[PDB]
Amino acid sequence: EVKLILYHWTHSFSSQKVRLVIAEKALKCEEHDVSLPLSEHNEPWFMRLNSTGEVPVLIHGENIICEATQIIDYLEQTFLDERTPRLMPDKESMYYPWVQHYRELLDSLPMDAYTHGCILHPELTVDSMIPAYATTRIRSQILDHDNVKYLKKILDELEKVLDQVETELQRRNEETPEEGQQPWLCGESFTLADVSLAVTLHRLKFLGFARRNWGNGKRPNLETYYERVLKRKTFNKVLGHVNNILIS
Amino acid sequence: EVKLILYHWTHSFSSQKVRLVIAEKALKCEEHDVSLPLSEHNEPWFMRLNSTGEVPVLIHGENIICEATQIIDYLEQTFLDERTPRLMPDKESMYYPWVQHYRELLDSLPMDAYTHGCILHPELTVDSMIPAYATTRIRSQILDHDNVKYLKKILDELEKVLDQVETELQRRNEETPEEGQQPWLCGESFTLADVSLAVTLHRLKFLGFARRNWGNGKRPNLETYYERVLKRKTFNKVLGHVNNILIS
């Protein structure tokens, strides 16, 4: 039969979203982790995050797509079996603009900039999971140069995106009955915007910028969202150990 | 050992150049032809040329590149063994500007536009190898719309690129002794610009625009170049039967 194939770096933002979509849609893929346990210079996966995560690539028989966003879209378009769950509304529906908006909003964030801003400029992190011995190595080894001003700017922009999200989630909470199917950001169905939000929050925690953005009575609906998605079966299967620096 | 892998459409301009580079550099790859012998609608490979040729993808252990030009560059950069022949001059050399210039010159051509301009607007072709039954199917089935003016414009631009090439080849002929190692476009070494020129000319013949551009005393040095490269072992191994509509 025509088989799905994927070549990816397990510890990569792109691959994380793609694999989560493959699991949400119940699709069976032949995932191949191409990442090395240790680099030529014996850099673990966390010290290697600076290195490009290598955009993933899907091979569906004859078709070939190589980009997280594109591969995700292709999976949605090609697998239309009634059993396969859909992670997007119908184009005609009045949901699609909102869903796509928030997906883009969260996909526009410069995660690559953050990942380098915690290794560097580590004072802006809180409870970062990246070993500090990587900071010194990167700082001395020497992409955009290190400007605390720049890093502080994009993090203030991250606050804006997450503030919008927090508002929408609060609206969801007000609408839903206490005892009832709790909805996600856009609706009761797990959308593509939810896979972006979920992976974003998870990576942010690895960087330590999570505590600053939500917690201790800040963005409470966002805090609840994160604890909820951490328990989801799909999340713990794909992204479960992706933040553990020991497992690699 | 770290192995090379490639997923490609045998009858695709991109894959043709890449596979030719892999052969010129003597590298061993695990090429996988993903193209189908016949489509879902039973369209042979030539009637399927309209369909995107699917950019190829190289997987070198941990590294992943998915674009003809990029994959070619990567192969040049990563395989630096003395045995591996180099298809480019040294960056410092005064050759590199010229070589890269002609490579870009020939890579800028809109081959995708030509491939659709011969199926459509077939009067501009001469001895086209595409069965004419594909023309009628495409013309009625209905990317940029069909304007004879547009097609005639880009073909006049193709004449300019090939006229430059013809001039450079004439200079090569004047420099070289009759009895001596005949040089290619840029020098005695087979460059990346030569793989572009070679595959370009070969595809053009499949489209029928070859006769118009060279032949019968027109661009004689270019005609000689084409007959010469057709005999090259690397060419007949990779691109040998890529223009034969029977072999598929």
Author numbering:
A (entry chain A), B (entry chain A): 23 to 164, 197 to 302
The publication says:
Charcot–Marie–Tooth disease (CMT) is the most common inherited peripheral polyneuropathy in humans, and its different subtypes are linked to mutations in dozens of different genes. Mutations in ganglioside‐induced differentiation‐associated protein 1 (GDAP1) cause two types of CMT, demyelinating CMT4A and axonal CMT2K. The GDAP1‐linked CMT genotypes are mainly missense point mutations. Structural analysis of GDAP1 indicates that CMT may arise from disruption of specific intra‐ and intermolecular interaction networks, leading to alterations in GDAP1 structure and stability, and, eventually, insufficient motor and sensory neuron function.
Here, we describe the biochemical and structural properties of the Finnish founding CMT2K mutation H123R and CMT2K‐linked R120W, both of which are autosomal dominant mutations. The disease variant proteins retain close to normal structure and solution behavior, but both present a significant decrease in thermal stability. Using GDAP1 variant crystal structures, we identify a side‐chain interaction network between helices ⍺3, ⍺6, and ⍺7, which is affected by CMT mutations, as well as a hinge in the long helix ⍺6, which is linked to structural flexibility.
